[PDB]
Coordinates of C-alpha atoms in Angstrom, one line a residue:
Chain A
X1 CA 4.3 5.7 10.7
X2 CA 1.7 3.1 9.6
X3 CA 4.6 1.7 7.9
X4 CA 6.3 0.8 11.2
X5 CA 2.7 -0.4 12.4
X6 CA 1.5 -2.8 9.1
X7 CA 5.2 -3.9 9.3
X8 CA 4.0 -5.0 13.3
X9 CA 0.9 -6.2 12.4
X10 CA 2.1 -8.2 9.2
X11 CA 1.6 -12.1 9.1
X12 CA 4.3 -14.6 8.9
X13 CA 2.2 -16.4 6.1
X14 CA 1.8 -13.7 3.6
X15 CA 0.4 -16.4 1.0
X16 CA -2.9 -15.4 1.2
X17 CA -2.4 -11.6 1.0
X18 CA 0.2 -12.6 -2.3
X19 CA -3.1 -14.4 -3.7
X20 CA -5.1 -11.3 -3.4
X21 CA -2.6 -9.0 -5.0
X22 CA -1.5 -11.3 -8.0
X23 CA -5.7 -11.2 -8.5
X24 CA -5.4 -7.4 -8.6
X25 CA -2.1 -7.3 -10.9
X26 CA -3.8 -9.5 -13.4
X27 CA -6.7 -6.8 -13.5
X28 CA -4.3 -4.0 -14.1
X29 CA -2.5 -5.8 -16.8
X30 CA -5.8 -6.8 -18.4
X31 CA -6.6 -2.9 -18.4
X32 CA -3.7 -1.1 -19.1
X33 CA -3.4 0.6 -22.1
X34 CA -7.2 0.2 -22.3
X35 CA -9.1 4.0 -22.2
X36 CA -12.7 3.0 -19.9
X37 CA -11.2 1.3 -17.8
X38 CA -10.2 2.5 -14.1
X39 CA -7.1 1.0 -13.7
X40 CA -6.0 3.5 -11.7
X41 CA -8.5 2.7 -9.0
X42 CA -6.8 -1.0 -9.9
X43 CA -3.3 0.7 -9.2
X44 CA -4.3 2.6 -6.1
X45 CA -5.7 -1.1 -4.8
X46 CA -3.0 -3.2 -5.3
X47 CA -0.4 -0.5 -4.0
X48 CA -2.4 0.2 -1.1
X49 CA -2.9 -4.0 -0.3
X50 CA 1.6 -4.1 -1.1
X51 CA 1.7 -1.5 1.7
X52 CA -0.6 -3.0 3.9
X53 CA 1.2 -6.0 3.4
X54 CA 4.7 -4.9 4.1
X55 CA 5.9 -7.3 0.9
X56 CA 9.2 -6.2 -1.0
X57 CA 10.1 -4.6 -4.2
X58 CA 11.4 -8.2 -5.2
X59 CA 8.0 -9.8 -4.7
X60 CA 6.4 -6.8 -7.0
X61 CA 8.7 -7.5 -9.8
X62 CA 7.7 -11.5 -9.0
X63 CA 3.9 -11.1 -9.4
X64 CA 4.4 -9.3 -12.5
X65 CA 7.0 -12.3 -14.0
X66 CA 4.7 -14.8 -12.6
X67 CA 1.4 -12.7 -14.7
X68 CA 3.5 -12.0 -18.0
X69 CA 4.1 -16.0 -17.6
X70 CA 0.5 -16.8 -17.2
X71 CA -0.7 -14.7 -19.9
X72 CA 1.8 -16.3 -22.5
X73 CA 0.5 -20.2 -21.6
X74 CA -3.0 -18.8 -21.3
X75 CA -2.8 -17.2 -25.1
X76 CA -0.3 -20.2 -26.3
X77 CA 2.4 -17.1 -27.0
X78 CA 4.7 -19.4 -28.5
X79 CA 8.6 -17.5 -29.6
X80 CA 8.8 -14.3 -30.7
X81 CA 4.6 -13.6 -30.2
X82 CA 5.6 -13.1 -26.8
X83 CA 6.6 -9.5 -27.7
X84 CA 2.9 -8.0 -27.4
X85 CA 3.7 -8.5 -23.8
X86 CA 6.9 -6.6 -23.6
X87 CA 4.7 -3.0 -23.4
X88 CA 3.8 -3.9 -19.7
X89 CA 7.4 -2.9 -18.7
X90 CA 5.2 0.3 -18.5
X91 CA 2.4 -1.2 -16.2
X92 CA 5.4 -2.2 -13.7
X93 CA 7.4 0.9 -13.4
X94 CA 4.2 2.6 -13.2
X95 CA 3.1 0.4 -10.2
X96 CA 6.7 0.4 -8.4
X97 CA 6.8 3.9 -8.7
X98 CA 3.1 4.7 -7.0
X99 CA 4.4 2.2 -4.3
X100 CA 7.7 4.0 -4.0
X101 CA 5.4 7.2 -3.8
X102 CA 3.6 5.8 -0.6
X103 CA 6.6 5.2 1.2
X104 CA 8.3 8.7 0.0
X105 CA 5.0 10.6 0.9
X106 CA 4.2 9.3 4.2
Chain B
X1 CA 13.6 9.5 9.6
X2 CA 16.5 11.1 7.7
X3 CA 13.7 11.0 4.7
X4 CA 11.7 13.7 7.0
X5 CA 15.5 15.5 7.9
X6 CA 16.8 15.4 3.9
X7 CA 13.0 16.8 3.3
X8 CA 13.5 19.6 5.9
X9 CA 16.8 20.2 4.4
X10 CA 16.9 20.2 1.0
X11 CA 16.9 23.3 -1.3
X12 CA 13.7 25.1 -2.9
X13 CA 16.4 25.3 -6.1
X14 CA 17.2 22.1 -6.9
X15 CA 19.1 22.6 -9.8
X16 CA 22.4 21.9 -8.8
X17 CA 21.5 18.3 -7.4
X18 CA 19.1 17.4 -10.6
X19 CA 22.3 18.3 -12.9
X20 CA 24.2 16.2 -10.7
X21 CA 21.9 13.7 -10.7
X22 CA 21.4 13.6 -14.5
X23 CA 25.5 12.6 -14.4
X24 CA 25.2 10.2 -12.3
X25 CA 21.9 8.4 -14.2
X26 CA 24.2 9.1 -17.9
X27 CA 27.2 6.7 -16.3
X28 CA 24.6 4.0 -15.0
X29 CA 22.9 4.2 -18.5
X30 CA 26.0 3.7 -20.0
X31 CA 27.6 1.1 -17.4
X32 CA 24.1 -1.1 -17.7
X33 CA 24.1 -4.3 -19.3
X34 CA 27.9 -4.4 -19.1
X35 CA 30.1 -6.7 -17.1
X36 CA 32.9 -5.6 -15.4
X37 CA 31.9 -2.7 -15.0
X38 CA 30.0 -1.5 -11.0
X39 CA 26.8 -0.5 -12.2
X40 CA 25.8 -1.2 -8.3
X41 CA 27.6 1.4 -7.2
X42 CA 26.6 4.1 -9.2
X43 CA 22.9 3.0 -8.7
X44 CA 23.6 3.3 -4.7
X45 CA 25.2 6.7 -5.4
X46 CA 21.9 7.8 -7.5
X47 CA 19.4 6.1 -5.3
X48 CA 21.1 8.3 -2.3
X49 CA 21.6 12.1 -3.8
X50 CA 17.8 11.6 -4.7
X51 CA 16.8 10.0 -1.0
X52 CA 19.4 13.5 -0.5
X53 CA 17.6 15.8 -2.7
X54 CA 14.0 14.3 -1.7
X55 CA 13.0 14.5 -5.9
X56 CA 9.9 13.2 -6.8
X57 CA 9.8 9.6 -8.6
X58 CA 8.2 12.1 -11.4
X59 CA 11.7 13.7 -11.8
X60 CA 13.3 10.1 -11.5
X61 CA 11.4 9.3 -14.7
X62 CA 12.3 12.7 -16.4
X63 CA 15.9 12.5 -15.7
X64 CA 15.7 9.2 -17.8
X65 CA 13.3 10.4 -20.5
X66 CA 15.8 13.3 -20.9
X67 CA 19.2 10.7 -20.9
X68 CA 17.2 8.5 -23.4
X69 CA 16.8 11.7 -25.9
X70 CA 20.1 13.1 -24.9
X71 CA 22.0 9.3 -26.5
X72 CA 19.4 9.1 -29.6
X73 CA 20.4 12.6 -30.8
X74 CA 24.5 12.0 -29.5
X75 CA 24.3 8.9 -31.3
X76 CA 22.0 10.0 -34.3
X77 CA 19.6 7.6 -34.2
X78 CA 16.7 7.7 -36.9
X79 CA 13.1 6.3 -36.4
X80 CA 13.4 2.2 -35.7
X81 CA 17.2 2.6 -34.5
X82 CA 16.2 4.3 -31.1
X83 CA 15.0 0.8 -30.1
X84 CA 18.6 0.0 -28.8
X85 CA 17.4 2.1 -26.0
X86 CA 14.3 -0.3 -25.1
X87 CA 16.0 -2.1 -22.6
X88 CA 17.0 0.9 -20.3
X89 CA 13.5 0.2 -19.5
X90 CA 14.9 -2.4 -17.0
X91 CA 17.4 0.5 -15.9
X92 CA 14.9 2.4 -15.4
X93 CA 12.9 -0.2 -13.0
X94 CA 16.2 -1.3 -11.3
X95 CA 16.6 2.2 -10.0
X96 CA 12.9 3.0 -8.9
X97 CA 12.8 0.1 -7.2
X98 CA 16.3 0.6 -5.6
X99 CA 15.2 3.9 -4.6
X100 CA 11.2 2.3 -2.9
X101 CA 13.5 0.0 -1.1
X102 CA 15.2 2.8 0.6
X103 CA 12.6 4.6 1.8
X104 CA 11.1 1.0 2.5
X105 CA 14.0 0.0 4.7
X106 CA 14.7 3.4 7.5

């Protein structure tokens, strides 16, 4: 079980590991949808770092809330404009499910 | 690991369990949103016949999919009217995750 191991080996300070994965959530929002773009290389990375990391379900759906609020001041959503973000519902159930596919398949 | 037991266990026909399980998902569905009402509990019961049944998070997603078309055509709903069912896509998240944090957790 590398599980049992990267829980071992995990840091107490896990802010610098949350850095690097809400750098690679904000790349797999910025290419979801979007044909050309690899974001399932983008997936497999961040799911492979949340692993690595031993970081909860809870702090998945809090990188994605903290993104979906970061896009909205960075475009100046204001109200109801905030709807072209509600599609990424998809992006999140399709990254909790590949990480809930790690733990299931090893 | 009860995940590697359950695996060794569990039936090459699981047909019995995925009907089961589609009951279960239709009372959580139908229990969500609501107060008063212990949507936790039928989420635990879900989260632990498929943890039981070792299904894929594939057939988590279909068993929804499935529910979703089963209440647009009960309740007859016509073209823009299915979007009543958009926010089973937080359901739909609150049980993946559920189920990533028990095979997270033993």
């Amino acid at each position: 079980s590398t599980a049992f191991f990267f829980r071992r080996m995990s840091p107490a300070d896990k802010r610098k590991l949350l850095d690097e994965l809400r750098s690679i959530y904000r790349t797999i929002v910025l290419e979801y949808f979007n044909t050309d773009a690899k974001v399932n290389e983008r997936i497999d990375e961040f799911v492979s770092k949340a692993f690595f990391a031993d970081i909860s379900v809870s702090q998945v759906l809090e990188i994605h809330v903290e993104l979906m609020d970061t896009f909205s001041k960075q475009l100046k959503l204001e109200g109801r404009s905030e709807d072209i973000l509600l599609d990424y519902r998809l992006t999140l159930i399709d990254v909790i499910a590949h990480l809930c596919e790690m733990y299931r398949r090893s």
